[PDB]
Design a protein around this motif. Sequence first.
Motif, PDB file in Angstrom:
ATOM      1  N   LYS A 194       0.846  -1.220   0.000  1.00  0.00           N
ATOM      2  CA  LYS A 194       0.000   0.000   0.000  1.00  0.00           C
ATOM      3  C   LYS A 194       0.895   1.291   0.000  1.00  0.00           C
ATOM      4  N   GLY A 195       2.150   1.156  -0.428  1.00  0.00           N
ATOM      5  CA  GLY A 195       3.074   2.251  -0.491  1.00  0.00           C
ATOM      6  C   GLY A 195       3.898   2.491   0.758  1.00  0.00           C
ATOM      7  N   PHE A 196       4.277   3.745   0.942  1.00  0.00           N
ATOM      8  CA  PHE A 196       5.095   4.142   2.102  1.00  0.00           C
ATOM      9  C   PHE A 196       4.257   4.549   3.304  1.00  0.00           C
ATOM     10  N   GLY A 197       2.967   4.787   3.096  1.00  0.00           N
ATOM     11  CA  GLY A 197       1.989   4.877   4.181  1.00  0.00           C
ATOM     12  C   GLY A 197       1.844   6.279   4.675  1.00  0.00           C
ATOM     13  N   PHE A 198       2.104   7.243   3.793  1.00  0.00           N
ATOM     14  CA  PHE A 198       1.827   8.642   4.094  1.00  0.00           C
ATOM     15  C   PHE A 198       1.215   9.402   2.885  1.00  0.00           C
ATOM     16  N   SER A 199       0.524  10.478   3.199  1.00  0.00           N
ATOM     17  CA  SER A 199      -0.058  11.387   2.216  1.00  0.00           C
ATOM     18  C   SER A 199       0.601  12.738   2.359  1.00  0.00           C
ATOM     19  N   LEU A 200       0.659  13.465   1.254  1.00  0.00           N
ATOM     20  CA  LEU A 200       1.126  14.838   1.271  1.00  0.00           C
ATOM     21  C   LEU A 200       0.130  15.822   0.684  1.00  0.00           C
ATOM     22  N   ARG A 201       0.274  17.047   1.119  1.00  0.00           N
ATOM     23  CA  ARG A 201      -0.564  18.114   0.595  1.00  0.00           C
ATOM     24  C   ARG A 201       0.365  19.263   0.209  1.00  0.00           C
ATOM     25  N   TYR A 257       3.706  19.295   2.828  1.00  0.00           N
ATOM     26  CA  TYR A 257       3.523  18.767   4.183  1.00  0.00           C
ATOM     27  C   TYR A 257       2.935  17.378   4.196  1.00  0.00           C
ATOM     28  N   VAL A 258       3.251  16.650   5.269  1.00  0.00           N
ATOM     29  CA  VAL A 258       2.557  15.405   5.642  1.00  0.00           C
ATOM     30  C   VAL A 258       1.107  15.682   6.091  1.00  0.00           C
ATOM     31  N   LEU A 259       0.154  15.052   5.387  1.00  0.00           N
ATOM     32  CA  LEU A 259      -1.246  15.230   5.581  1.00  0.00           C
ATOM     33  C   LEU A 259      -1.786  14.095   6.424  1.00  0.00           C
ATOM     34  N   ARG A 260      -1.439  12.857   6.061  1.00  0.00           N
ATOM     35  CA  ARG A 260      -1.923  11.631   6.708  1.00  0.00           C
ATOM     36  C   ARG A 260      -0.817  10.599   6.845  1.00  0.00           C
ATOM     37  N   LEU A 261      -0.951   9.757   7.871  1.00  0.00           N
ATOM     38  CA  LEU A 261      -0.093   8.605   8.072  1.00  0.00           C
ATOM     39  C   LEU A 261      -0.981   7.409   8.156  1.00  0.00           C
TER      40      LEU A 261
END
Length: 90
Positions: free
Chosen positions: A13-20, A30-34
């Motif tokens: 499922k990837g690296f497991g973070f979202s950016l905005r 920035y990091v949006l979600r983990l």
Amino acid sequence: MDFYTVELERGAKGFGFSLRGGREYNMDLYVLRLAEDGPAERSGKMRIGDEILEINGETTKNMKHSRAIELIKNGGRRVRLFLKRGETSV
């Protein structure tokens, strides 16, 4: 000195973070979600709100969102990130 680095290994499922953000939205990155259970959260190092200063050796200064996403997805087995916490001691 609120700067830190992290190196993540891709999971299914990837690296497991979202950016905005990004330069096309007149914003920094920035990091949006983990993602729960994912490599980013398992690292214990990252939080929501941390600013991404470099991805895989490339500075994010004036980087488009699209470009940051492309670098991470296409970067192979890992991602190397340089971050800033947005905390200051006064």
